[PDB]
Amino acid sequence: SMEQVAMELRLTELTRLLRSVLDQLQDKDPARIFAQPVSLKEVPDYLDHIKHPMDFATMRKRLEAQGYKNLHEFEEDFDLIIDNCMKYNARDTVFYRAAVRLRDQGGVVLRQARREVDSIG
Numbered sequence: 001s002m003e004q005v006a007m008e009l010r011l012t013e014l015t016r017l018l019r020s021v022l023d024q025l026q027d028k029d030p031a032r033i034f035a036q037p038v039s040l041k042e043v044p045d046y047l048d049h050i051k052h053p054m055d056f057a058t059m060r061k062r063l064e065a066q067g068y069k070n071l072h073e074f075e076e077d078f079d080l081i082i083d084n085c086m087k088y089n090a091r092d093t094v095f096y097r098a099a100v101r102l103r104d105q106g107g108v109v110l111r112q113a114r115r116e117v118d119s120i121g
């Protein structure tokens with residue numbers, strides 16, 4: 001049907017907007033602390049602490065599989081990156097401090113992407 005194609009043109013457009021958003025969020029992690037999953041060879045107990053790990057490459061794979069159905073799902077994954085890090089690491093660590101900075105700086109980007117997703121439909 002033509003109705004499923006017009007849908008898929010929009011999902012494709014949403015994928016295109018979210019790709020831009022992701023690149024801007026990741027530019028706020030120049031240390032690349034959140035780039036890749038936490039290593040289970042290096043932190044073997046990690047899953048005892050964190051039930052839903054998340055990182056930027058894992059979000060990218062989902063994105064390129066058009067697996068985000070809306071901005072809310074994308075944001076949830078971004079928040080997991082931050083919240084996991086803030087639980088697993090103590091307050092006086094470079095890791096915790098990096099997540100605080102990413103949250104604060106990411107807010108500006110997510111605020112404008114909310115408006116662009118509503119505006120464009």
Ligand code: NA
Pocket residue numbers: 086087088089090
């Ligand atoms: Na903690």
